[PDB]
């Protein structure tokens, strides 16, 4: 169904179905378990305006 929804490009429904209908807390779980394996899954986003490397809340 994810493959079908993203085939339609209807990606805001896909976002709804995969996040707030139940970073997302399950990605928090993913990063926390890898961080528990002693791997830093580190999420950054780069300001287009300022090139500042904003670390995401993870």
């Amino acid at each position: 169904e994810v493959w079908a929804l993203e085939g339609f490009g209807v990606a805001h429904i896909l976002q709804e179905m995969l996040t707030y209908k139940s970073a997302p807390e399950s990605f928090r779980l993913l990063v926390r378990e890898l961080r528990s394996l002693a791997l830093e899954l580190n999420h950054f986003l780069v300001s287009e305006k300022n090139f500042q490397i904003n670390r995401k809340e993870v």
């Binding site: 780069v46 287009e48 305006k49 300022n50 090139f51 490397i53």
Partner: protein, 198 residues
């Protein structure tokens, strides 16, 4: 008829002569003389007074002459507003620029040329940060700058490294239908290359 016309003629000629000589005290003399002649309304006369102040940079005197002509007169002719906005942008005073440009809304005059002048003079006066403020707030207001002004402002921003505004102006330029050329992307890349994040 011809009496009033010749009085108007000679009085406004000696006023304009004082104004070109940047003598606003003289212009005030001729205002008083025309009031004594009963020629009380006259937009050209207060335009002469404002340009007499502006040519010597008397921002306060220019605003005083504006307050005179609005408070005890009639709507100013466009060159009055344009000249006082130019005196702002050439002096700095960008807040006064925006305040008067917003006050131009109430005359129904074309704001485009005055805003272009304000931006251009601010850039020429190296008042780039507030020039960016007035430009972006105009573009978000849906006004289109002249192409020369986009090109100059982008180039000067990128020389200043102000990509935070250069990219935004480039988006507004695209939204205005001026497609970004290799020059504009070269200007953006000149600053982007500095970030160390290729």
């Amino acid at each position: 008829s011809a009496l009033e016309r010749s009085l108007r003629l000679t009085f406004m000629d000696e006023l304009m002569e004082r104004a070109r000589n940047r003598d606003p005290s003289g212009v005030s003399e001729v205002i008083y003389d025309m009031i004594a002649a009963g020629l009380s309304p006259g937009p050209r006369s207060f335009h002469g007074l404002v340009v007499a102040h502006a040519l010597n940079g008397d921002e306060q005197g220019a605003m005083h002459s504006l307050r005179k002509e609005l408070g005890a007169g009639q709507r100013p002719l466009p060159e009055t507003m344009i000249a006082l906005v130019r005196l702002s942008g050439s002096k700095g005073n960008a807040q006064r620029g925006l305040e008067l440009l917003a006050a131009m809304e109430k005359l129904n005059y074309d704001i485009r040329q005055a805003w272009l002048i304000l931006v251009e003079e601010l850039v020429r006066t190296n008042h780039l940060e507030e020039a960016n403020k007035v430009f972006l707030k105009g573009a978000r207001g849906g006004m289109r700058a002249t192409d020369q002004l986009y090109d100059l402002m982008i180039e000067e921003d990128c020389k200043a490294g102000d990509h935070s505004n250069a990219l935004d102006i480039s988006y507004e330029m695209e939204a205005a239908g001026r497609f970004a050329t290799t020059f504009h992307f070269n200007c953006l890349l000149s600053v982007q290359a500095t970030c160390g994040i290729p």
